[PDB]
Amino acid sequence: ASRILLNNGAKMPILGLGTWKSPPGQVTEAVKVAIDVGYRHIDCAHVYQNENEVGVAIQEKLREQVVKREELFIVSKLWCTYHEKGLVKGACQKTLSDLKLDYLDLYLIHWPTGFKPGKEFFPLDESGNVVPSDTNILDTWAAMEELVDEGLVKAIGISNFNHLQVEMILNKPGLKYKPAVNQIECHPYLTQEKLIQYCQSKGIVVTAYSPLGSPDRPWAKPEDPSLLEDPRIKAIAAKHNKTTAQVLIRFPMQRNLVVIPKSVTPERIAENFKVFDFELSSQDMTTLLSYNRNWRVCALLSCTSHKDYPFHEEF
Numbered sequence: 001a002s003r004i005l006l007n008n009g010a011k012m013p014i015l016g017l018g019t020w021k022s023p024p025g026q027v028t029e030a031v032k033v034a035i036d037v038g039y040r041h042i043d044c045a046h047v048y049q050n051e052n053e054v055g056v057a058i059q060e061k062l063r064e065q066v067v068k069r070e071e072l073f074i075v076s077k078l079w080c081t082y083h084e085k086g087l088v089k090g091a092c093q094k095t096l097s098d099l100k101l102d103y104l105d106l107y108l109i110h111w112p113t114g115f116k117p118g119k120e121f122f123p124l125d126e127s128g129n130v131v132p133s134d135t136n137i138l139d140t141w142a143a144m145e146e147l148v149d150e151g152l153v154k155a156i157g158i159s160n161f162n163h164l165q166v167e168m169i170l171n172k173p174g175l176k177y178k179p180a181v182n183q184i185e186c187h188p189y190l191t192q193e194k195l196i197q198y199c200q201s202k203g204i205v206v207t208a209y210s211p212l213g214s215p216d217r218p219w220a221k222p223e224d225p226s227l228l229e230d231p232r233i234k235a236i237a238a239k240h241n242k243t244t245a246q247v248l249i250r251f252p253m254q255r256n257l258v259v260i261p262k263s264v265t266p267e268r269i270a271e272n273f274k275v276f277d278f279e280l281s282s283q284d285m286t287t288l289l290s291y292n293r294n295w296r297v298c299a300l301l302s303c304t305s306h307k308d309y310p311f312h313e314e315f
């Protein structure tokens with residue numbers, strides 16, 4: 001099916017358009033093209049600095065009646081410098097204003113790590129360590145819960161939370177709403193079997209980010225593995241008469257994940273959506289799972305001493 005049921009009773013499109021690194025000059029057209037070719041979920045974030053332009057596309061397509069608001073599933077994320085309970089509503093409201101929306105379908109805590117509030121997204125001391133916030137995950141969560149109760153967001157969730165941090169929210173005293181989604185990096189080099197099973201066993205839907213391995217990541221290195229160029233994955237694609245990207249997108253779909261490939265290229269936006277017409281075998285799936293090497297696109301080194309840094313733990 002095209003959507004998965006969340007624990008808030010709403011349905012989430014299992015394919016979304018990513019927007020991290022989408023240049024502000026190209027992302028309006030990218031989102032317009034995506035909605036024209038069937039996408040109904042857009043993944044956004046304030047820290048991506050392009051929500052105004054994403055919003056321009058969404059508003060044009062609503063105005064043109066290409067789509068109804070209820071048919072769209074718009075996701076954004078609370079940045080690290082806004083974990084303070086008094087800053088969360090404003091941060092949500094800024095995103096809503098930029099996206100030109102009156103609600104979000106899903107609002108995520110972008111990272112478990114809270115940073116010192118200010119203009120700077122990564123406030124630094126003088127050695128390059130990020131300056132933390134003394135706010136913890138649970139008070140931030142309560143602030144996310146207020147957003148539901150004020151009508152600004154239909155669902156709340158988390159991102160880059162490890163097993164122990166998901167468990168800490170689930171066990172929060174007085175918990176009012178469980179997280180609906182945990183959005184985490186996931187692809188055949190970082191298969192995440194343990195965290196995904198835990199999350200799904202608790203009724204939390206997992207969204208897979210960087211499913212193509214983020215070839216446009218700013219810190220890429222030549223020696224780095226490349227999913228898109230992996231001859232083993234190309235072979236599975238050839239067998240199925242599909243591209244390597246389409247296999248990489250179908251793979252998490254068949255693990256009951258949501259997946260959010262990014263492109264600003266019209267032809268690739270369309271290609272990436274054409275993944276509902278073929279099936280990977282269980283052997284294919286087990287084969288792709290076997291390529292795991294615990295390789296992460298997203299592990300900022302600048303936050304490794306933060307107390308809530310999520311990736312010291314086995315998962």
Ligand SMILES: NC(=O)c1ccc[n+]([C@@H]2O[C@H](COP(=O)([O-])OP(=O)(O)OC[C@H]3O[C@@H](n4cnc5c(N)ncnc54)[C@H](OP(=O)(O)O)[C@@H]3O)[C@@H](O)[C@H]2O)c1
Nearest residue numbers: 018019020209210211212213214216245261262263264265
């Ligand atoms: N929660 C968080 O912490 C977090 C972290 C990372 C990512 N995410 C979200 O997840 C989304 C996806 O992750 P990502 O942006 O890191 O990378 P990705 O989706 O794995 O890869 C994007 C790269 O792949 C290229 N590409 C797209 N379709 C292609 C195709 N069919 N064939 C060949 N190349 C193709 C894109 O190029 P062009 O754009 O030039 O076409 C771009 O360089 C992000 O945009 C963001 O929305 C969330």
Ligand SMILES: O=C(O)CSc1nnc(-c2ccc([N+](=O)[O-])o2)o1
Nearest residue numbers: 020111113298299300301303309310
């Ligand atoms: O966040 C994205 O969507 C891409 S930009 C990014 N990558 N890694 C970070 C981050 C923030 C906190 C941590 N941390 O590792 O504690 O890492 O920000």
